Symmetry: C2
Subunit: 257 residues, 2 copies
């Protein structure tokens, strides 16, 4: 009966969390949204009036441009899709369950292969992350024992603090490279790092997509390394926080009578 | 030395997997990509000649349209963002790490809150999925014991088969709708189900945004239920497959001496 009670309590807490978050986000974003929509409508009206065009023609043109944009066409000089390097980027985003969406299959045959490829490849990456976490815990224990100088395993709190510090350092080091090379601010770089590392992958900000990219040989390698390390660290941090949340739920159940 | 060897072997296998997958995907998709680009170029040239507009003016108009699209505007009628139910959909996509990208924060203050909200909310959903898997295993053992009529826990193989059957049934039941209600083909519905359930979330196909949606009260509830069950089942299946892959890695290590 304890497991059922814990399950029900967690479900209720998540429901309340979702409701509160929805209210807060709506209150934060509604005015901005409405203002942006009004600005777009004014711009569209001005363009239509200036060049004496018709709305239906503009709707057809925009539908064609929407089709072209899913094909892959952009307005500022993007790198080609479905070359070997682009395919490598795509499969890397697939196996990590990031799913930026900048590149998607469009043919029958590439979607069946997409399904089978993901079905065979995502568990391997999950196992790799688990093995990385185990190795990191072992090396942390060994380092601590050597510094003090088996039974020297660190507690969960210290592992959480170390993972937080590592994540902060990795994010600030990746941002220190993203900000100059891209046209991004430091806060935007940190936001992109958080969105990519947590495997949410909104897709609004994607790096390394500007055709000629200066040196472009070391830059792609550095991007790959940074994303890999960040994803590993954030995965481990989330697992530790989940363990702590389970302990807190147990305490909440015990206190209530 | 066994753990290091297993880590190295898994890394090498994943690297080879990525290379082969990139080569296959590129060979599958390059011709379609080139044909789509040529079609878009021809359409743009025909519009330009049709109405004698200069290229730069069209580039500016398309940049404005991209900015508008980043705020939610589409050529078809779509539901509003951030009212109260769009926010609920957004937070649901956030906590499950799906990240469709149809709705993203655009203000300073909504991005800090996004970071903290995700940091506190993703581990809770991970814990919920783990508890669901434990409860499912327990109930499966109970049903098996009752049918035969503690030590009656099923093997990993049978759990994998049952999870596969449940995933297929849930996908087919969800695809029974989504097909007439949204103009989608059955194969497209199955592809969308796989992409959403695995928490990849490309965002090319997103369900339940067409402004007026007939009943629209029961339909949203059914969509919520279907996505929740599918994500749970696919998460459990991936964990079981990861366990099997680890066993296979141990076997190949033993064979290589
Ligand atoms: C040592 C290998 C271990 C296995 C790696 C596992 C998962 C892959 C992780 C992250 C994907 C990173 C995105 C690819 C970047 C390509 C670089 C570029 O072209 O810009
Ligand atoms: C009751 C158990 C609580 C646990 C829920 C946990 C995570 C939420 C997961 C998936 C929700 C996906 C978003 C679907 C919302 C659609 C609603 C609409 O169409 O408007
Ligand atoms: C620019 C590199 C793209 C091809 C990917 C392979 C090289 C980097 C990773 C190799 C690690 C062994
Ligand atoms: C139409 C759905 C409105 C948004 C909130 C719905 C909450 C109902 C599902 C969970 C109740 C336990
Ligand atoms: C230790 C690596 C971090 C330093 C890289 C800074 C790059 C700044 C110039 C783009
Ligand atoms: C122009 C600088 C871009 C390359 C960054 C070098 C980092 C490589 C070592 C990790
Ligand atoms: C649970 C089985 C019912 C789901 C399919 C309903 C079909 C809906 C479209 C008419
Ligand atoms: C018209 C279809 C509306 C959805 C019916 C399904 C509701 C029960 C699902 C459990
Ligand atoms: C007897 C407890 C039932 C729990 C139902 C939970 C629904 C998600
Ligand atoms: C196009 C050059 C990259 C080829 C990959 C090399 C892997 C060893
Ligand atoms: C010998 C232990 C290997 C751990 C290395 C971790 C690399 C970041
Ligand atoms: C084009 C230079 C490739 C740099 C990556 C090689 C690292 C082993
Ligand atoms: C000597 C142990 C192997 C470390 C190589 C790094 C693996 C990514
Ligand atoms: C628990 C009831 C919540 C109702 C949400 C608002 C309905 C429009
Ligand atoms: C003993 C109650 C378990 C509930 C499982 C519900 C699965 C939908
Ligand atoms: C508008 C009808 C609401 C449907 C939700 C049912 C509550 C369990
Ligand atoms: C936090 C309770 C919900 C209030 C907004 C509908
Ligand atoms: C799988 C070997 C490499 C394929 C050609 C780049
Ligand atoms: K995702
Ligand atoms: K995504
Ligand atoms: K994900
Ligand atoms: K996405």
């Amino acid at each position: 009966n304890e497991d059922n009670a814990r399950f029900l309590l967690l479900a209720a807490l998540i429901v309340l969390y979702l409701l509160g978050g929805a209210a807060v986000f709506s209150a934060l974003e509604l005015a901005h949204e409405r203002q942006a929509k009004q600005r777009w409508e004014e711009r569209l009206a001005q363009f239509s009036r200036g060049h004496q065009l018709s709305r239906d023609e503009l709707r057809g043109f925009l539908r064609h441009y929407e089709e072209a944009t899913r094909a892959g066409i952009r307005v500022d000089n993007v790198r080609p899709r479905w070359d070997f390097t682009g395919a490598f980027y795509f499969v890397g985003t697939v196996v990590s369950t990031i799913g930026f969406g900048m590149t998607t299959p469009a043919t029958v045959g590439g979607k069946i292969f997409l399904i089978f490829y993901g079905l065979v490849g995502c568990p391997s990456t999950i196992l790799f992350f688990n093995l990385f976490l185990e190795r990191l815990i072992t090396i942390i224990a060994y380092i601590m024992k050597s510094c003090h100088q088996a039974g020297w395993k660190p507690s969960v709190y210290y592992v959480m603090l170390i993972l937080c510090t590592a994540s902060i350092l990795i994010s600030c080091c990746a941002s220190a490279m993203y900000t100059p090379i891209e046209g991004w601010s430091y806060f935007d770089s940190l936001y992109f790092c958080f969105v990519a590392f947590s495997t949410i992958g909104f897709g609004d900000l994607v790096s390394s997509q500007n055709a000629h990219y200066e040196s472009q040989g070391l830059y792609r390698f550095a991007n790959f390394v940074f994303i890999l390390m960040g994803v590993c660290c954030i995965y481990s941090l989330f697992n530790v926080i989940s363990i702590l949340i389970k302990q807190s739920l147990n305490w909440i159940l015990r206190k209530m009578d």
